[PDB]
Design a protein around this ligand. Structure first.
Ligand SMILES: Nc1ncnc2c1ncn2[C@@H]1O[C@H](COP(=O)(O)OS(=O)(=O)O)[C@@H](O)[C@H]1O
Ligand SMILES: Nc1ncnc2c1ncn2[C@@H]1O[C@H](COP(=O)(O)OS(=O)(=O)O)[C@@H](O)[C@H]1O
Ligand SMILES: Nc1ncnc2c1ncn2[C@@H]1O[C@H](COP(=O)(O)OS(=O)(=O)O)[C@@H](O)[C@H]1O
Ligand SMILES: [Ca+2]
Ligand SMILES: [Ca+2]
Ligand SMILES: [Ca+2]
Ligand SMILES: [Ca+2]
Ligand SMILES: [Ca+2]
Ligand SMILES: [Ca+2]
Ligand SMILES: [Ca+2]
Ligand SMILES: [Ca+2]
Ligand SMILES: [Mg+2]
Ligand SMILES: [Mg+2]
Ligand code: NA
Ligand code: NA
Ligand code: NA
Ligand code: NA
Ligand code: NA
Ligand code: NA
Ligand code: NA
Ligand code: NA
Ligand code: NA
Ligand code: NA
Ligand code: NA
Ligand code: NA
Ligand code: NA
Ligand code: NA
Ligand code: NA
Ligand code: NA
Lengths: 510, 510, 255
């Protein structure tokens, strides 16, 4: 179908004859420079390559308010997710309309020249409730208030180059490239599959089922820009993707990476994804259960209903200009060893089986077996390798403030005790002395599978520098992960307590 | 047998009722304090527990000299390895005879009180020549010159407690404790086996043969104090010993760890080992090929003849009062599927097979297979876990000073590329900013199996702070491990050279 | 010993006959189990004979048969006791039983599914799998219906090349019968050999009886087509995908 709004706004093509000139302006001594954030990098690439057509820059207050309240750009164009350049007061104060700012990547690579239209201070609570449904634990809201600048800068963009990427040079196709790919294959019907998670048997079946339903070739279009915090990394996922694409009949599927930054915005996001897939050359788009939804909040309640996205998308059906292929929960059928949409079964008579993501993380954490029917063996292998079970995981034991015993001796005892277990883990007594340079390496070691014995705590102001993953507190306090009986509990007694705790939590298996 | 010299100088027992008194003195504001070095802790434990009987302290110039030139203490007692307290000029200068110095561990645990007899500056050249045969590459000589203090302090000791060890609490039997272990079992003939390496089929076979010829029970007595630089860590070796002990007929062997600090002084060390094992209650001591030998130097010449230790020990036979059970090279006979001393075969009509330590390291380095005939599987598994193959090993790539491409960009490019491969390894771009607190962490990461991308070299005066294992230089210079064609070579070109270099060396396997 | 008898699958009457035959062959006893010599159920799901009619008929001629009949009620498997036993000696609840019907077995054999160690002997299952191979090892034919308007020569070639890219040891051929019986009769031979036949056009109805319909599928616009076309001129690439996914849905292809 035609790109949204009718014209693929591929600004790299458009501005090809201005590259040299633009390149020089960005590197000039007098121009104002803004280093793009990782989310702004994902967005600008989608803007510059035509993926966000009809967009040609970051939204000004007028288009943004319309998107916020109407799910449309000022001119009525259907657009549900606001794409804005968020900066701080300090930088904002340095600009006015007509100003030309140069946008860089890593303070080295010039990306584009932005021509300012306006500078405004959005009300984040309206944006938070209107676009994302207001729940503070929502990834998009949490980001909006804790990471995004308080000032947005609207303006038109002029391309210099798409953001740099060194992984998968050939796989990140632009809308124009993907289109030639389909074309060279004479693919006039293509159903796209959005995904930010690894694909399992269920996913493979619903995509093939969609291919057969729509008489279309299959496009696996995974997101490799930002997704939901805690997701399985994109490198591990590409490997899972490149592995599962081989379980499709030869010549039916095509894999392409999408550097999009999701907002995990359920129904609104699905609408957005469809627009994006149409721009990329798909004629059909899949929207399954809880599409782009972030699950449930700490209180156990749904951010979106399991089929809100399908409903919202269904309502814009006639103006989307891309065919939506909906699916109800596809589940496994033990008694028939096959997969099928829950809306075509049940009513009792047939038993169904499902393994939730929570159940999988857990199987991966304990080293438990994962059913041959659930996923493909080689996919499970790739997942176990990058998300190793507890006995292969790193961890840190932090000697609390309350300790009265010898910190030097308690550390040595823990180090020697741990070293006698063996099993390939590397241990170290780690002194951070409250230095950020050091504090920030803690999670690197844990990520490497190492066990760190930490002699004393870091001051509270520094706490934010350290991830708390697999970091455990030894102390007399009630908030200690490993609770001491007394501040001066003898060393041997403490070592046993720590050893058995680490074993109870699977770090040690004898 | 009776302890060497007639009396088991068990100073922990001798001074039991002086413990509280010696502790008080040791903690007085007035007393001069010296913090024991690691080798000294090894030596002090053997002196304090009677393993070094008749020694009751560190040698005075008189005994030291005798030993160096005469392989005997001044009173004639056979003794081949000098055991001295080496300190620096600053400390030595505060010492005066008849003074009482407190010897501590980790600057906190009081170990003993030393009553000084003299302070002297030994001629380290004579000691290296007479005791260790003069080759500067000999571990004992390298230690003597680069680590040991330049001043010796002779004096008698009063025990407060043996050095602290939190690993293997019940396995470090003191001479008095082992002697009790033997008695409780009615063992009156015990042949001891010394070792600082993992044990394989050959070792099991020779120890059993020794048991049979001598009609004695078996004492596996491995060294867990200092051994040769580059040996398999003692924690790993202990697991190996604990596994192999199970391959002996039930009730024939006993395992006891020896906190000895070897000097790798072949023949002289052999005699010393005999005296030590006699002190620990053994009636027989095995002396195999190149006993306590460090092998060959740079030019490929031998530090000792493969049977010098046997010859020396034989020449002191009537003095030792412990029966030496000698063994010629024990090897494998493929065609008969059994091990045997080489002196009782060959005839150039019998095929023999052997795998040198070098061949083994290598098989472990590449993840090669190890013959079930060479070693027991459980033993090999333990060895691979602690010394894993290249695809599971860590490494660092250092962007050389010569490089004129963007260090920031080359770094990210290498990171993104490695991440594409997956396989578990954790990667980090590591900036040391020439701070040793950071530089000293590089080998911990390599030790943790991680891959480090270091954007620039550290000062030449910091090299010592950084290990050399799996650290590669990316540069235009001849000294580069991965040589660039020019300092401005394009990033993608550099990335390929690096990736293929690591593959060639096994870190990556596709 | 092998018996070259031609059964009539005549339940109770047949059992009587079998007994007479076994007595003639020298047996002193003859077994008559559940649904002995019965042909199961008809298309309407109803029994041709009752599960124990044969036992009953045989019991009634007991005194003149002059051969001892050893009857058996349904012998089934006991999970909880890992043993087999006549259903008349168990149940009443208390003990759970397991059985795999012939229908269930044919199906396990057709999909390549596993068959319980307790059900049959491994070496017996092996022999059965080898002669009744699962779908990915089975032959089949795709017949280009009369209604097709696209190029039959081109549609056939496209299917042949598509199938050939999957591999897995199957042999394919464009097969022209030109309505000849000599040819039409070889169709099931190829299928029996595991081959995939692309058939350019249908054979006239009078000849249909010459061809077994086993694994023979019809591509056409009709409602009676196994693989139903959207239109008579649906483009080739679209048709190929439809046929490929159908063959996969039915297990002939497994990726
Ligand atoms: N079991 C399932 N049944 C139906 N749809 C599913 C199922 N699992 C995933 N999907 C769909 O697969 C697509 C991508 O799935 P995910 O990667 O888990 O999440 S999402 O954020 O990209 O939507 C979505 O359209 C989603 O609704
Ligand atoms: N293959 C062998 N044949 C004979 N003796 C051996 C053999 N291997 C090792 N030994 C002996 O086993 C004892 C300990 O071996 P190692 O741990 O390798 O080295 S040592 O430094 O303690 O001597 C020594 O007596 C040594 O000479
Ligand atoms: N599970 C069973 N329980 C009792 N009898 C059985 C069972 N299975 C087969 N039989 C008996 O085994 C004999 C031959 O079985 P089949 O080969 O299946 O069929 S038959 O046509 O020759 O009778 C018959 O006497 C039949 O009733
Ligand atoms: Ca703010
Ligand atoms: Ca719900
Ligand atoms: Ca207390
Ligand atoms: Ca010196
Ligand atoms: Ca030699
Ligand atoms: Ca150049
Ligand atoms: Ca019935
Ligand atoms: Ca038509
Ligand atoms: Mg890019
Ligand atoms: Mg000790
Ligand atoms: Na259109
Ligand atoms: Na920089
Ligand atoms: Na709803
Ligand atoms: Na339209
Ligand atoms: Na349609
Ligand atoms: Na618990
Ligand atoms: Na200290
Ligand atoms: Na000399
Ligand atoms: Na003897
Ligand atoms: Na010699
Ligand atoms: Na004696
Ligand atoms: Na090579
Ligand atoms: Na009946
Ligand atoms: Na009769
Ligand atoms: Na009878
Ligand atoms: Na079906």
């Amino acid at each position: 179908p035609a790109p949204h709004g009718g014209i693929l706004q591929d600004l790299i093509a458009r501005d090809a004859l201005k590259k040299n000139e633009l390149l020089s302006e960005a590197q000039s001594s007098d121009i104002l420079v803004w280093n793009l954030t990782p989310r702004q990098l994902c967005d600008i690439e989608l803007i510059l390559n035509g993926g966000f057509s009809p967009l040609t820059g970051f939204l000004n207050e007028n288009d943004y308010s319309s998107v916020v309240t109407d799910s449309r750009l000022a001119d009525g164009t259907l657009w549900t997710i606001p794409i804005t350049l968020d900066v701080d007061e300090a930088f904002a104060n340095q600009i006015k309309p007509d100003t030309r700012i140069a946008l860089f990547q890593d303070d080295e690579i010039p990306i584009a020249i932005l021509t300012v239209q306006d500078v405004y201070k959005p009300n984040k609570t309206i944006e938070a409730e209107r676009v994302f449904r207001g729940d503070p634990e929502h990834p998009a809201i949490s980001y909006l208030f804790n990471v995004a600048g308080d000032y947005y800068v609207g303006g038109s963009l002029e391309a210099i180059q798409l953001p740099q990427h060194y992984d998968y040079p050939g796989l990140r196709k632009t809308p124009a490239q993907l289109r030639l790919e389909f074309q060279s294959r004479q693919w006039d019907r293509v159903v796209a599959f959005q995904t930010r998670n690894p694909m399992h048997r269920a996913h493979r079946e619903l995509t093939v089922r969609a291919a057969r339903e729509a008489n279309a070739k299959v496009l696996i279009h995974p997101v490799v820009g930002l997704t939901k915090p805690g997701d399985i990394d994109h490198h591990t996922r590409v490997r899972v993707y490149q592995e599962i694409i081989k379980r499709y009949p030869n010549g039916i599927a095509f894999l392409s990476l999408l550097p999009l930054a999701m907002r995990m915005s359920g129904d609104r996001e699905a609408v957005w994804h469809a627009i994006i897939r149409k721009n990329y050359g798909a004629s059909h788009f899949i929207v399954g259960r809880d599409h782009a939804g972030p699950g449930k909040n700490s209180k156990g309640v749904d951010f979106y209903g399991p089929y809100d996205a399908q409903e919202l998308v269904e309502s814009y059906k006639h103006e989307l200009d891309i065919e939506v292929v909906p699916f109800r929960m596809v589940t496994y059928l033990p008694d028939e060893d096959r997969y099928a949409p829950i809306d075509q079964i049940d009513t009792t008579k047939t038993r169904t089986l499902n393994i939730s993501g929570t159940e999988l993380r857990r199987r991966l954490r304990v080293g438990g077996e994962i059913p041959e029917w659930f996923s493909y063996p080689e996919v499970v292998k790739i997942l176990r390798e990058s998300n190793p079970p507890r006995p292969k995981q790193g961890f840190s034991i932090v000697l609390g403030n309350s300790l009265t015993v010898s910190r030097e001796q308690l550390s040595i005892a823990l180090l020697s005790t741990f070293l006698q277990f063996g099993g390939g883990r590397y241990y170290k007594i780690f002194e951070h002395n409250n230095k950020t340079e050091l504090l920030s390496l803690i999670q690197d070691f844990i990520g490497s599978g190492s066990g760190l014995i930490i002699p004393d705590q870091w001051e509270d102001d520094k706490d934010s520098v350290v991830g708390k993953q697999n970091v455990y507190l030894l102390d007399t306090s009630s908030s200690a992960d490993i609770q001491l009986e007394s501040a001066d509990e003898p060393i041997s007694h403490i070592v046993q307590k720590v050893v058995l705790f680490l074993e109870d939590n699977g770090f040690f298996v004898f």
